[PDB]
Amino acid sequence: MSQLSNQEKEYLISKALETEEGRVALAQAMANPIRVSLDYQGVGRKLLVVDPLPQG
Amino acid sequence: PYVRLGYEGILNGAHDIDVAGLNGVEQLAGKFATIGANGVKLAGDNGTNAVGLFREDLGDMVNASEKASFYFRGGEYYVNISRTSLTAAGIAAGDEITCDADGKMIKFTGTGKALGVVTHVGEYRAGNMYEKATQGVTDTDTFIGFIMYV
Amino acid sequence: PYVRLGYEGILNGAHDIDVAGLNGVEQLAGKFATIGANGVKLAGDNGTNAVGLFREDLGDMVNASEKASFYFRGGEYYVNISRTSLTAAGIAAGDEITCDADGKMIKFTGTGKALGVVTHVGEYRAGNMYEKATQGVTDTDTFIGFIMYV
Amino acid sequence: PYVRLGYEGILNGAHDIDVAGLNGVEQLAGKFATIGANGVKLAGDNGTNAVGLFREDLGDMVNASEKASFYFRGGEYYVNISRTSLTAAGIAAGDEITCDADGKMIKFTGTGKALGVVTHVGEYRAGNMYEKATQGVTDTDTFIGFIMYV
Amino acid sequence: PYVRLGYEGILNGAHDIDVAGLNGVEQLAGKFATIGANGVKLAGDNGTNAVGLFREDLGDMVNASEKASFYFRGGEYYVNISRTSLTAAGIAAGDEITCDADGKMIKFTGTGKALGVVTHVGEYRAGNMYEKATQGVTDTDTFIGFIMYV
Amino acid sequence: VIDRAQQRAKADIMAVEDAEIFSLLEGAATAVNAVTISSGGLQRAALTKAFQEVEK
Amino acid sequence: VIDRAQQRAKADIMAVEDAEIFSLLEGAATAVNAVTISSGGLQRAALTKAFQEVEK
């Protein structure tokens, strides 16, 4: 209450400070920094991988 | 000494909104019921409204009054079809409300004709603009907490 | 364009722009009447048209429609319909008169499609609107004499 | 998506969806897009398409969503289906419009998933804005991560 | 193969499903395709090949195979195991596929909708035969992403 | 100083005072609770949980 | 960055765009990490497991 005699206003305002400075915090769910990155030249990748080796 | 007016300290009872006129049916293009008209729960101005009348300021939420009275738009002043408000904040049932637009009895607030500006207690008073659009009953001088048929 | 001399007639209803009660979307914002135009009775006493097309001004005054047979720009159809179901009333000298917009049923004629009521001044129904697209099915079970929702 | 490339260009809505005679505030009921004048098209002319969010005005009129540094108006926000246009989802302004929450699919800036709001400059965007209120119901068809009808 | 009974995205009939032997081989869990549909594409042509004609390679790899310029097999050319495609290009709807021989249903694609032709873009296409070979025993009747029997 | 903290969190408002911050904020995080784990443990367990959230 | 993470981890077997763990994976034996009824025990057990493959 802005009176001692009882009345309120709620929509009439002045001297705003820290308006539109809110956020919504987001939990980490990255994988890009967790693998290694290197620059490369080419327009596609060819990869070779080894399969199960014989044993016994 | 010391007397509250509006803001949930006045009791305006309850009134029936399915009384007078044609009565539509339950459908969408409604809006939400809360205290505050752009506010949040437990923070809202309030007229002498009970059941009937509530005007959006920001968002698609309603509670009583608040919106320039030079131009009323949205399809009527919004009325309730087949739920009767159980608060005296004007509307603030806490549900999504399906609204209508048939002729339907309302509760008014503020002295004199609405054709003015908004008082930030939840009322209409005369502004610098005159011969602006009125609400409900015409030809008849309206006062604070009159019962109008739209 | 600019047609309709004097008062409106009585033909297949003629109140709530032909019989139907208070349905559709409404507003019912009253506001004062200036003298009509574009039929007879331009000045002095009663107006032009008695339940036909009326048009809102930009100071929130109401008079006979000043607009006719414009194409390729937006809609706008305003009628002056009083508060009570099955009553509609026209402009007079002075006094606050409650107006409405469409959301009433009208009567169509022809085999075309109504996309609304006549572009020109006056009338309380759609004509045979060749002045609007015939294209696509707008209001189901289209035939001559059928009651169309505007 | 099918052999030799998936979807591209505009994609077909539902045509001739006719909704009429409603008692409430919905945009579904045959009613106008108004900017001012007298509506569009001659006989045998076919509409265009326009997607975005529209807002109900005074009487039984709709117009485009603008700002948020001005008042929120009318019920739910909706996107336009066809019933005069023979082409896709959409309508040309100054017709009777049925809207839906389906507008599939004409691209325009951002997306419409989980309700839509109006931004503070007047673009159309998706939720969630308020979590304490219910905004215009436009629940879009699956089409995400790519430009689309809001 | 050589029995007329085609039609379907997956028939359970004979020479339409293998699971070891029977003019083609199937693994008991598949191998994943690094060319063609394997996971769900929502666009893209996925490289060359969309008409079948793959070879399974060592470990969990499926890879390219194709026909030299100016030739067509008189024998049975490779096709995949018969799948639907909810994906742009590939035969698979994001499944892990194995290679077979003739007797399995594929999707064809192109600019025609008459009998099959041979292209040396490493695909076969829909054309009209006149000097270029047709594809499948029930020819090519494709409307793009129709299930044709090989 | 005491009364101010009470109204601000929540302590019964009559729609005449500042909003009830404690109500509006994030519900109970079931994840923290390892099922039949000590109360003191809960307070330790929660502190880390806010760091995962990316809130100071 | 996230969309990259989202493919990279999971997408109904992918290796026509971003190689993902699940497509690539061979073997996996829960028995080696023992069996536990506490989230922590599995996590303690887990750190060691990469060392068996001959990966640090």
PDB file of N, CA and C in Angstrom, chain D residues 4-81:
ATOM      1  N   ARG D   4      13.879 -39.932 -54.153  1.00  0.00           N
ATOM      2  CA  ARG D   4      14.326 -38.847 -55.045  1.00  0.00           C
ATOM      3  C   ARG D   4      13.937 -37.471 -54.562  1.00  0.00           C
ATOM      4  N   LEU D   5      13.894 -37.343 -53.265  1.00  0.00           N
ATOM      5  CA  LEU D   5      13.851 -36.052 -52.513  1.00  0.00           C
ATOM      6  C   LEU D   5      12.468 -35.945 -51.847  1.00  0.00           C
ATOM      7  N   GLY D   6      12.476 -35.448 -50.561  1.00  0.00           N
ATOM      8  CA  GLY D   6      11.226 -35.280 -49.823  1.00  0.00           C
ATOM      9  C   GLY D   6      10.466 -34.095 -50.223  1.00  0.00           C
ATOM     10  N   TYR D   7       9.727 -33.497 -49.243  1.00  0.00           N
ATOM     11  CA  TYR D   7       8.925 -32.304 -49.440  1.00  0.00           C
ATOM     12  C   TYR D   7       9.670 -31.059 -49.830  1.00  0.00           C
ATOM     13  N   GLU D   8       9.112 -30.268 -50.697  1.00  0.00           N
ATOM     14  CA  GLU D   8       9.569 -29.003 -51.185  1.00  0.00           C
ATOM     15  C   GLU D   8       8.388 -28.159 -51.581  1.00  0.00           C
ATOM     16  N   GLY D   9       8.526 -26.778 -51.514  1.00  0.00           N
ATOM     17  CA  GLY D   9       7.572 -25.787 -51.921  1.00  0.00           C
ATOM     18  C   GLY D   9       6.377 -25.831 -51.063  1.00  0.00           C
ATOM     19  N   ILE D  10       5.261 -25.238 -51.469  1.00  0.00           N
ATOM     20  CA  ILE D  10       4.049 -25.225 -50.701  1.00  0.00           C
ATOM     21  C   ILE D  10       3.280 -26.586 -50.785  1.00  0.00           C
ATOM     22  N   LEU D  11       2.455 -26.865 -49.755  1.00  0.00           N
ATOM     23  CA  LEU D  11       1.884 -28.137 -49.531  1.00  0.00           C
ATOM     24  C   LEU D  11       0.441 -27.858 -49.053  1.00  0.00           C
ATOM     25  N   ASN D  12      -0.558 -28.745 -49.462  1.00  0.00           N
ATOM     26  CA  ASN D  12      -1.968 -28.521 -49.547  1.00  0.00           C
ATOM     27  C   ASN D  12      -2.553 -28.761 -48.216  1.00  0.00           C
ATOM     28  N   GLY D  13      -3.498 -27.794 -47.833  1.00  0.00           N
ATOM     29  CA  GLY D  13      -4.302 -27.712 -46.668  1.00  0.00           C
ATOM     30  C   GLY D  13      -5.626 -28.490 -46.888  1.00  0.00           C
ATOM     31  N   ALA D  14      -6.720 -28.055 -46.234  1.00  0.00           N
ATOM     32  CA  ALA D  14      -7.949 -28.566 -46.357  1.00  0.00           C
ATOM     33  C   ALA D  14      -8.762 -27.527 -46.899  1.00  0.00           C
ATOM     34  N   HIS D  15      -9.687 -27.907 -47.813  1.00  0.00           N
ATOM     35  CA  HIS D  15     -10.359 -26.929 -48.626  1.00  0.00           C
ATOM     36  C   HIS D  15     -11.821 -27.006 -48.351  1.00  0.00           C
ATOM     37  N   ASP D  16     -12.481 -25.888 -48.405  1.00  0.00           N
ATOM     38  CA  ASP D  16     -13.925 -25.797 -48.242  1.00  0.00           C
ATOM     39  C   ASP D  16     -14.434 -26.266 -46.879  1.00  0.00           C
ATOM     40  N   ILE D  17     -13.644 -26.081 -45.815  1.00  0.00           N
ATOM     41  CA  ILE D  17     -14.049 -26.344 -44.434  1.00  0.00           C
ATOM     42  C   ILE D  17     -14.946 -25.238 -43.955  1.00  0.00           C
ATOM     43  N   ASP D  18     -16.259 -25.568 -43.807  1.00  0.00           N
ATOM     44  CA  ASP D  18     -17.286 -24.599 -43.646  1.00  0.00           C
ATOM     45  C   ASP D  18     -17.785 -24.769 -42.293  1.00  0.00           C
ATOM     46  N   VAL D  19     -17.677 -23.744 -41.461  1.00  0.00           N
ATOM     47  CA  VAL D  19     -18.151 -23.715 -40.151  1.00  0.00           C
ATOM     48  C   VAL D  19     -18.970 -22.567 -40.090  1.00  0.00           C
ATOM     49  N   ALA D  20     -20.224 -22.678 -39.529  1.00  0.00           N
ATOM     50  CA  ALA D  20     -21.172 -21.640 -39.532  1.00  0.00           C
ATOM     51  C   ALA D  20     -22.165 -21.826 -38.362  1.00  0.00           C
ATOM     52  N   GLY D  21     -22.694 -20.683 -37.884  1.00  0.00           N
ATOM     53  CA  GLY D  21     -23.779 -20.666 -36.865  1.00  0.00           C
ATOM     54  C   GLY D  21     -23.359 -20.845 -35.436  1.00  0.00           C
ATOM     55  N   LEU D  22     -22.185 -20.379 -35.058  1.00  0.00           N
ATOM     56  CA  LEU D  22     -21.656 -20.587 -33.767  1.00  0.00           C
ATOM     57  C   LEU D  22     -22.091 -19.495 -32.858  1.00  0.00           C
ATOM     58  N   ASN D  23     -22.266 -19.781 -31.545  1.00  0.00           N
ATOM     59  CA  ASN D  23     -22.728 -18.856 -30.683  1.00  0.00           C
ATOM     60  C   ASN D  23     -21.705 -17.964 -29.968  1.00  0.00           C
ATOM     61  N   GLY D  24     -20.389 -18.406 -29.929  1.00  0.00           N
ATOM     62  CA  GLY D  24     -19.255 -17.852 -29.102  1.00  0.00           C
ATOM     63  C   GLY D  24     -18.450 -16.818 -29.884  1.00  0.00           C
ATOM     64  N   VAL D  25     -17.099 -16.790 -29.619  1.00  0.00           N
ATOM     65  CA  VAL D  25     -16.249 -15.747 -30.084  1.00  0.00           C
ATOM     66  C   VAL D  25     -15.311 -16.281 -31.112  1.00  0.00           C
ATOM     67  N   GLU D  26     -15.469 -17.580 -31.504  1.00  0.00           N
ATOM     68  CA  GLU D  26     -14.503 -18.205 -32.435  1.00  0.00           C
ATOM     69  C   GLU D  26     -14.457 -17.547 -33.799  1.00  0.00           C
ATOM     70  N   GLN D  27     -13.264 -17.616 -34.364  1.00  0.00           N
ATOM     71  CA  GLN D  27     -12.844 -17.200 -35.682  1.00  0.00           C
ATOM     72  C   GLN D  27     -13.309 -18.165 -36.815  1.00  0.00           C
ATOM     73  N   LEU D  28     -13.665 -19.434 -36.429  1.00  0.00           N
ATOM     74  CA  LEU D  28     -14.132 -20.556 -37.196  1.00  0.00           C
ATOM     75  C   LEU D  28     -15.378 -20.119 -37.898  1.00  0.00           C
ATOM     76  N   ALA D  29     -16.283 -19.389 -37.192  1.00  0.00           N
ATOM     77  CA  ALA D  29     -17.508 -18.932 -37.776  1.00  0.00           C
ATOM     78  C   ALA D  29     -17.254 -17.894 -38.798  1.00  0.00           C
ATOM     79  N   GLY D  30     -18.073 -17.967 -39.917  1.00  0.00           N
ATOM     80  CA  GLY D  30     -17.945 -17.204 -41.119  1.00  0.00           C
ATOM     81  C   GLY D  30     -18.006 -15.739 -40.793  1.00  0.00           C
ATOM     82  N   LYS D  31     -16.808 -15.150 -41.057  1.00  0.00           N
ATOM     83  CA  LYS D  31     -16.578 -13.789 -40.567  1.00  0.00           C
ATOM     84  C   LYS D  31     -15.279 -13.286 -41.155  1.00  0.00           C
ATOM     85  N   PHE D  32     -15.167 -11.922 -41.100  1.00  0.00           N
ATOM     86  CA  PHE D  32     -14.465 -11.127 -42.031  1.00  0.00           C
ATOM     87  C   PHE D  32     -13.085 -10.839 -41.563  1.00  0.00           C
ATOM     88  N   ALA D  33     -12.119 -10.529 -42.510  1.00  0.00           N
ATOM     89  CA  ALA D  33     -10.868  -9.873 -42.200  1.00  0.00           C
ATOM     90  C   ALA D  33     -11.082  -8.458 -42.662  1.00  0.00           C
ATOM     91  N   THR D  34     -10.906  -7.483 -41.751  1.00  0.00           N
ATOM     92  CA  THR D  34     -11.320  -6.150 -41.967  1.00  0.00           C
ATOM     93  C   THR D  34     -10.059  -5.308 -41.706  1.00  0.00           C
ATOM     94  N   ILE D  35      -9.857  -4.311 -42.653  1.00  0.00           N
ATOM     95  CA  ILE D  35      -8.841  -3.300 -42.544  1.00  0.00           C
ATOM     96  C   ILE D  35      -9.590  -2.019 -42.826  1.00  0.00           C
ATOM     97  N   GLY D  36     -10.688  -2.093 -43.605  1.00  0.00           N
ATOM     98  CA  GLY D  36     -11.557  -1.090 -43.919  1.00  0.00           C
ATOM     99  C   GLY D  36     -11.768  -1.317 -45.406  1.00  0.00           C
ATOM    100  N   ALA D  37     -13.071  -1.019 -45.870  1.00  0.00           N
ATOM    101  CA  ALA D  37     -13.636  -0.733 -47.193  1.00  0.00           C
ATOM    102  C   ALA D  37     -14.687  -1.745 -47.295  1.00  0.00           C
ATOM    103  N   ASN D  38     -14.845  -2.412 -48.480  1.00  0.00           N
ATOM    104  CA  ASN D  38     -15.822  -3.376 -48.812  1.00  0.00           C
ATOM    105  C   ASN D  38     -15.023  -4.425 -49.475  1.00  0.00           C
ATOM    106  N   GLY D  39     -15.329  -5.720 -49.126  1.00  0.00           N
ATOM    107  CA  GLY D  39     -14.523  -6.924 -49.403  1.00  0.00           C
ATOM    108  C   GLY D  39     -14.115  -7.065 -50.800  1.00  0.00           C
ATOM    109  N   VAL D  40     -13.393  -8.219 -51.045  1.00  0.00           N
ATOM    110  CA  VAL D  40     -12.615  -8.613 -52.155  1.00  0.00           C
ATOM    111  C   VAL D  40     -13.226  -9.576 -53.119  1.00  0.00           C
ATOM    112  N   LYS D  41     -12.493  -9.646 -54.240  1.00  0.00           N
ATOM    113  CA  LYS D  41     -12.781 -10.460 -55.401  1.00  0.00           C
ATOM    114  C   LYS D  41     -14.015 -10.119 -56.180  1.00  0.00           C
ATOM    115  N   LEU D  42     -14.042 -10.448 -57.560  1.00  0.00           N
ATOM    116  CA  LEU D  42     -15.253 -10.406 -58.391  1.00  0.00           C
ATOM    117  C   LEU D  42     -15.564 -11.868 -58.541  1.00  0.00           C
ATOM    118  N   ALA D  43     -16.650 -12.190 -59.221  1.00  0.00           N
ATOM    119  CA  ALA D  43     -16.956 -13.576 -59.609  1.00  0.00           C
ATOM    120  C   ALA D  43     -15.828 -14.196 -60.387  1.00  0.00           C
ATOM    121  N   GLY D  44     -15.573 -15.492 -60.170  1.00  0.00           N
ATOM    122  CA  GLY D  44     -14.623 -16.286 -60.893  1.00  0.00           C
ATOM    123  C   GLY D  44     -13.136 -15.957 -60.640  1.00  0.00           C
ATOM    124  N   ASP D  45     -12.872 -15.202 -59.569  1.00  0.00           N
ATOM    125  CA  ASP D  45     -11.525 -14.834 -59.083  1.00  0.00           C
ATOM    126  C   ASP D  45     -11.336 -15.681 -57.928  1.00  0.00           C
ATOM    127  N   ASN D  46     -10.050 -16.159 -57.831  1.00  0.00           N
ATOM    128  CA  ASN D  46      -9.637 -17.069 -56.813  1.00  0.00           C
ATOM    129  C   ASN D  46      -8.740 -16.316 -55.782  1.00  0.00           C
ATOM    130  N   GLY D  47      -8.963 -16.646 -54.478  1.00  0.00           N
ATOM    131  CA  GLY D  47      -8.141 -15.981 -53.448  1.00  0.00           C
ATOM    132  C   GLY D  47      -6.615 -16.107 -53.577  1.00  0.00           C
ATOM    133  N   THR D  48      -5.939 -15.508 -52.575  1.00  0.00           N
ATOM    134  CA  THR D  48      -4.523 -15.820 -52.330  1.00  0.00           C
ATOM    135  C   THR D  48      -4.510 -16.597 -51.038  1.00  0.00           C
ATOM    136  N   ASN D  49      -3.344 -16.680 -50.478  1.00  0.00           N
ATOM    137  CA  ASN D  49      -3.079 -17.324 -49.225  1.00  0.00           C
ATOM    138  C   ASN D  49      -2.261 -16.275 -48.512  1.00  0.00           C
ATOM    139  N   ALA D  50      -2.519 -16.362 -47.187  1.00  0.00           N
ATOM    140  CA  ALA D  50      -1.869 -15.601 -46.122  1.00  0.00           C
ATOM    141  C   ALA D  50      -1.934 -16.385 -44.852  1.00  0.00           C
ATOM    142  N   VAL D  51      -0.756 -16.758 -44.233  1.00  0.00           N
ATOM    143  CA  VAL D  51      -0.644 -17.420 -42.970  1.00  0.00           C
ATOM    144  C   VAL D  51      -0.011 -16.467 -42.035  1.00  0.00           C
ATOM    145  N   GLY D  52      -0.404 -16.577 -40.735  1.00  0.00           N
ATOM    146  CA  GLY D  52       0.154 -15.786 -39.635  1.00  0.00           C
ATOM    147  C   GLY D  52      -0.842 -15.962 -38.494  1.00  0.00           C
ATOM    148  N   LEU D  53      -0.817 -15.071 -37.411  1.00  0.00           N
ATOM    149  CA  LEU D  53      -1.748 -15.117 -36.331  1.00  0.00           C
ATOM    150  C   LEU D  53      -2.547 -13.793 -36.434  1.00  0.00           C
ATOM    151  N   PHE D  54      -3.836 -13.962 -36.190  1.00  0.00           N
ATOM    152  CA  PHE D  54      -4.878 -12.946 -36.351  1.00  0.00           C
ATOM    153  C   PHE D  54      -5.542 -12.955 -35.043  1.00  0.00           C
ATOM    154  N   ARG D  55      -6.302 -11.846 -34.797  1.00  0.00           N
ATOM    155  CA  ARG D  55      -6.790 -11.510 -33.516  1.00  0.00           C
ATOM    156  C   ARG D  55      -8.192 -10.949 -33.803  1.00  0.00           C
ATOM    157  N   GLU D  56      -9.221 -11.279 -32.977  1.00  0.00           N
ATOM    158  CA  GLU D  56     -10.498 -10.787 -33.124  1.00  0.00           C
ATOM    159  C   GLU D  56     -10.643  -9.338 -32.628  1.00  0.00           C
ATOM    160  N   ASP D  57     -11.346  -8.513 -33.409  1.00  0.00           N
ATOM    161  CA  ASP D  57     -11.577  -7.147 -33.135  1.00  0.00           C
ATOM    162  C   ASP D  57     -12.930  -6.929 -32.676  1.00  0.00           C
ATOM    163  N   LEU D  58     -13.474  -5.662 -32.594  1.00  0.00           N
ATOM    164  CA  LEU D  58     -14.880  -5.274 -32.378  1.00  0.00           C
ATOM    165  C   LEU D  58     -15.688  -5.868 -33.513  1.00  0.00           C
ATOM    166  N   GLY D  59     -16.946  -6.158 -33.165  1.00  0.00           N
ATOM    167  CA  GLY D  59     -17.905  -6.858 -33.947  1.00  0.00           C
ATOM    168  C   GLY D  59     -17.372  -8.256 -34.364  1.00  0.00           C
ATOM    169  N   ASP D  60     -17.697  -8.706 -35.605  1.00  0.00           N
ATOM    170  CA  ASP D  60     -17.336 -10.012 -36.030  1.00  0.00           C
ATOM    171  C   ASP D  60     -16.307  -9.857 -37.147  1.00  0.00           C
ATOM    172  N   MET D  61     -15.149  -9.244 -36.780  1.00  0.00           N
ATOM    173  CA  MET D  61     -13.983  -8.912 -37.582  1.00  0.00           C
ATOM    174  C   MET D  61     -12.731  -9.541 -36.959  1.00  0.00           C
ATOM    175  N   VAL D  62     -11.659  -9.888 -37.765  1.00  0.00           N
ATOM    176  CA  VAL D  62     -10.366 -10.319 -37.412  1.00  0.00           C
ATOM    177  C   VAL D  62      -9.345  -9.313 -38.123  1.00  0.00           C
ATOM    178  N   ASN D  63      -8.108  -9.165 -37.583  1.00  0.00           N
ATOM    179  CA  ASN D  63      -7.066  -8.311 -38.315  1.00  0.00           C
ATOM    180  C   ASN D  63      -5.767  -9.006 -37.730  1.00  0.00           C
ATOM    181  N   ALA D  64      -4.625  -8.521 -38.146  1.00  0.00           N
ATOM    182  CA  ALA D  64      -3.329  -9.095 -37.824  1.00  0.00           C
ATOM    183  C   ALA D  64      -2.839  -8.773 -36.463  1.00  0.00           C
ATOM    184  N   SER D  65      -1.979  -9.610 -35.825  1.00  0.00           N
ATOM    185  CA  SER D  65      -1.413  -9.398 -34.532  1.00  0.00           C
ATOM    186  C   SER D  65      -0.276  -8.418 -34.616  1.00  0.00           C
ATOM    187  N   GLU D  66      -0.296  -7.459 -33.676  1.00  0.00           N
ATOM    188  CA  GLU D  66       0.601  -6.362 -33.656  1.00  0.00           C
ATOM    189  C   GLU D  66       1.032  -5.990 -32.285  1.00  0.00           C
ATOM    190  N   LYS D  67       2.355  -5.705 -32.098  1.00  0.00           N
ATOM    191  CA  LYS D  67       2.980  -5.374 -30.853  1.00  0.00           C
ATOM    192  C   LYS D  67       2.714  -6.246 -29.643  1.00  0.00           C
ATOM    193  N   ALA D  68       3.184  -5.805 -28.478  1.00  0.00           N
ATOM    194  CA  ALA D  68       2.886  -6.312 -27.190  1.00  0.00           C
ATOM    195  C   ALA D  68       3.108  -5.228 -26.172  1.00  0.00           C
ATOM    196  N   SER D  69       3.230  -4.017 -26.745  1.00  0.00           N
ATOM    197  CA  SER D  69       3.495  -2.699 -26.124  1.00  0.00           C
ATOM    198  C   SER D  69       2.217  -1.881 -26.374  1.00  0.00           C
ATOM    199  N   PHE D  70       1.168  -2.622 -26.912  1.00  0.00           N
ATOM    200  CA  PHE D  70      -0.230  -2.393 -27.009  1.00  0.00           C
ATOM    201  C   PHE D  70      -0.836  -3.669 -26.450  1.00  0.00           C
ATOM    202  N   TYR D  71      -2.096  -3.481 -25.875  1.00  0.00           N
ATOM    203  CA  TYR D  71      -3.076  -4.492 -25.353  1.00  0.00           C
ATOM    204  C   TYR D  71      -3.317  -5.698 -26.223  1.00  0.00           C
ATOM    205  N   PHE D  72      -3.572  -6.843 -25.546  1.00  0.00           N
ATOM    206  CA  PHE D  72      -3.900  -8.114 -26.186  1.00  0.00           C
ATOM    207  C   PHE D  72      -5.431  -7.995 -26.371  1.00  0.00           C
ATOM    208  N   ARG D  73      -5.870  -8.515 -27.542  1.00  0.00           N
ATOM    209  CA  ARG D  73      -7.299  -8.344 -27.965  1.00  0.00           C
ATOM    210  C   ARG D  73      -7.816  -9.642 -28.482  1.00  0.00           C
ATOM    211  N   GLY D  74      -9.151  -9.858 -28.206  1.00  0.00           N
ATOM    212  CA  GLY D  74      -9.933 -11.029 -28.654  1.00  0.00           C
ATOM    213  C   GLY D  74      -9.437 -12.304 -28.036  1.00  0.00           C
ATOM    214  N   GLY D  75     -10.184 -13.395 -28.327  1.00  0.00           N
ATOM    215  CA  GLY D  75      -9.852 -14.676 -27.819  1.00  0.00           C
ATOM    216  C   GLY D  75      -8.534 -15.237 -28.336  1.00  0.00           C
ATOM    217  N   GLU D  76      -8.545 -16.560 -28.616  1.00  0.00           N
ATOM    218  CA  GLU D  76      -7.365 -17.342 -29.087  1.00  0.00           C
ATOM    219  C   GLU D  76      -6.842 -16.836 -30.377  1.00  0.00           C
ATOM    220  N   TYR D  77      -5.515 -16.989 -30.619  1.00  0.00           N
ATOM    221  CA  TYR D  77      -4.909 -16.754 -31.930  1.00  0.00           C
ATOM    222  C   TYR D  77      -4.945 -17.988 -32.714  1.00  0.00           C
ATOM    223  N   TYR D  78      -5.247 -17.793 -34.049  1.00  0.00           N
ATOM    224  CA  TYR D  78      -5.519 -18.857 -34.947  1.00  0.00           C
ATOM    225  C   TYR D  78      -4.893 -18.605 -36.259  1.00  0.00           C
ATOM    226  N   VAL D  79      -4.795 -19.617 -37.209  1.00  0.00           N
ATOM    227  CA  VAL D  79      -4.203 -19.442 -38.535  1.00  0.00           C
ATOM    228  C   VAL D  79      -5.224 -19.856 -39.589  1.00  0.00           C
ATOM    229  N   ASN D  80      -5.147 -19.393 -40.818  1.00  0.00           N
ATOM    230  CA  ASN D  80      -6.332 -19.364 -41.668  1.00  0.00           C
ATOM    231  C   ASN D  80      -6.406 -20.646 -42.556  1.00  0.00           C
ATOM    232  N   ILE D  81      -7.571 -21.314 -42.637  1.00  0.00           N
ATOM    233  CA  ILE D  81      -7.692 -22.449 -43.524  1.00  0.00           C
ATOM    234  C   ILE D  81      -8.342 -21.919 -44.837  1.00  0.00           C
TER     235      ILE D  81
END
